[PDB]
Structures are given as C-alpha cells and as structure tokens.
Amino acid sequence: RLPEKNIILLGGTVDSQREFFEALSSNDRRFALGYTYYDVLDADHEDTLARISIYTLTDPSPAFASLLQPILTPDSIPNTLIVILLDWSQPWKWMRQLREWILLLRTVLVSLSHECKATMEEVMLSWRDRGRGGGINLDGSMTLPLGPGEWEDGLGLPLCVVCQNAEKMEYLEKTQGWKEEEFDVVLQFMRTVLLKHGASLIYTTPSVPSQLPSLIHSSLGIHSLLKKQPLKHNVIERDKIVVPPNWDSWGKIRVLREGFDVERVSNGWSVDLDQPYPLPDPEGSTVVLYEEAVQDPT
C-alpha cells in the first residue's frame, strides 16, 4: 500500500553495492537482476513515506539489461532513478565506464512501448525545473531559459552517479603524486558530461555520513512532511562532492580551475554517445580527452 519507488543500480562490486545500500538506507529505514528493498522513514524516523525497490546489475551485459524491460512500465517510469556506481580506486576508467552504461541503458529504453516512451518524455519535461530555484522543489513538490549543455541529452529517466570509496583520493595523493588540481579536472570532466543528462554527482566514503539519502530520496520524488532543508551542494571539499540536479552550469564548471574547455568536452560527449551498442574511438571523443588527462598508473 506504500508508494513504490525503484532504483536501477548499475556497476560496483558485491561489497560496494551492499555499502551503497547501507549508506542509502542507514538512518531512515524501518536469469535475474539482484533485488532488495527498504521502507523509507521521514526525518523524525517515525512515519514511513515510501518503499524503495532496488534492482542491481553489476556488469554491462546486454542480456541482463533486457531484464529491465518488464520493470519499466508507464506506472513505474515516473518513480524510477538510475544510479551508476563508480570507484575512486580507478578514476581513469570513469568516462569509458559511464559511456558504456549510458549506451547500454539507451538500448533498453528505445525498446520500450510507445506509451513508455511518452511517459519518459513527460518525466523529462517535468525534470527541467525540479530543484532549479523557481517554483519546483527537487522532490517534485511545489512552492530563466536553460544554459548551454543543460539537458541537451535527457535519457528518459533521471540519473545519479555515485563515486564510491572517496578515501582513495588520499591514497592517490600520497602514492601516485596526484595534486588537488587533478581531482578538480576529474570533477570538471564529470560535471560537464553529466550536465547534459540533468544528472547528479556525489562522492561517498564507507561509514562517513553524507547527503546520499536526501539526494536519492528527493530524486525519487519522496516528499518529506517535516523537513524543508534543501540539499547542500559542494564542489570544493574534494572528497565530499555533491552536485544536485538543475544546479550546475558551464559558468560554474569553468571557474573551478582555469584551462578547461567545457564546450569541447561537452561536444566530445555527443561524439561518444552517437555510436552503436555494443571498435576504435571516434575523433573528438571525450572518453579520449578524459583518458589523456587522467592517466592510468598502468
């Protein structure tokens, strides 16, 4: 009888998915995809607001991706969030991993019924203003034209990217010589491509409290009857990044550090996503730009 919400959880490992689940549901909780769920409590830890179902796909398999079809119906689509897990142990892999998941996901979404696609268009239209500072809160409850890059590439569903094990940033600083400005460049690259999908970005560390529950629950359209504090965005304190939807812009991305060609990187992401799924990297690719900038210690 509870409102039902879905998370489609992509990537990670067995342990990092479980860590995601704990981080997500710690405070405010009471041939197949992995499955679990939990009941979300309101901010006083009393009343139950929604039941969140999580469907998990660790690897970008086309076979198992097909299992998403039955989960995405006209009724479920407006209640669904895509979450991609990335790992701070291997940030050099991020842009390529992200491209693969998005191409995979697109393959599923174009295959849904006309009614599903009409519903996804409705969802995308309504997301334009959610949490944008005008009339509409991030959670979809009520209270200027779009900058460049913003929502140029709506997926049909909202996306949240969660970069796990951020304690490994300190590891890269001390054993691989990474400087503050290298973490910032990663951030500029991620913010730029994700902006095109209207997507959020958040870094987490196991056992370190974060805004992950508030971000995910608000993105799922779960409306607190007690709390009106909005999300707190951060792009400065490097291991606690929080970039909520409809907050970022090229203007903001460009000032983090100098020398970042935001438009080139945004156009390179068009090059990357205009490709069949599932050999060589196309001219202008942002995966290539990223992988030149963020090198693998091989």
DSSP code string of the chain: ---EEEEEEEE--HHHHHHHHHHHHTTTB----EEEEEEEE-TTS-SEEEEEEEEEE-S--HHHHGGGGGG--TTTGGGEEEEEEEETT-GGGHHHHHHHHHHHHHHHHTTS-HHHHHHHHHHHHHHTSTTSSSSB-TTS-B--PPPTTTTTT--SS-EEEEEE-TTHHHHHHHHS---HHHHHHHHHHHHHHHHTTT-EEEE--TTS--SHHHHHHHHTT---SS--PPP--BSSSTTS-EE-TTT--HHHHHHHSSS--HHHHHHHHHHHHSS----PPPTT-HHHHHHHHS----
Q: Count other C-beta atoms under 10 Å from residue 115's C-beta.
A: 11
The β-bridge relationship of strands 4-11 and 34-41 is: unpaired
Q: Is the peptide bond before 278 cis (omega within 30 degrees of 0)?
A: yes
Q: How far are the Cα atoms of 257, 266, 273, 285, 296 from residue 282, in angstroms, in the given order?
A: 27, 15, 10, 6, 20
Among 285, 258, 225, residue whose Cα is nearest residue 40: 225
Cβ proximity of 73 and 33 under 8 Å:
no
| b/e per residue 261-287 (b: at least 16 CB within 10 A) | ebeebbebbebbbeeeeeeeeeeebbb
Alpha carbon 140 to chain centroid, angstroms = 17
Q: How far is CA 281 from CA 181, 266, 273, in A?
A: 27, 16, 11
Q: Which residues contact 25 (CB under 8 A, 6 or more apart)?
A: 38, 40, 52, 213
Nearest one of 157, 148, 169 to 252, comparing CA atoms:
148
In terms of Cβ atoms closer than 10 Å to its own Cβ (0-12, 13-18, 19+), residue 296 is exposed
- Experimental approach: X-ray
Place of tokens 């019924």: 113
How, if at all, do strands 200-203 and 34-41 pair? unpaired
Contact 221, 140 (CB under 8 A): yes
Q: What is the resolution of this structure in A?
A: 2.1
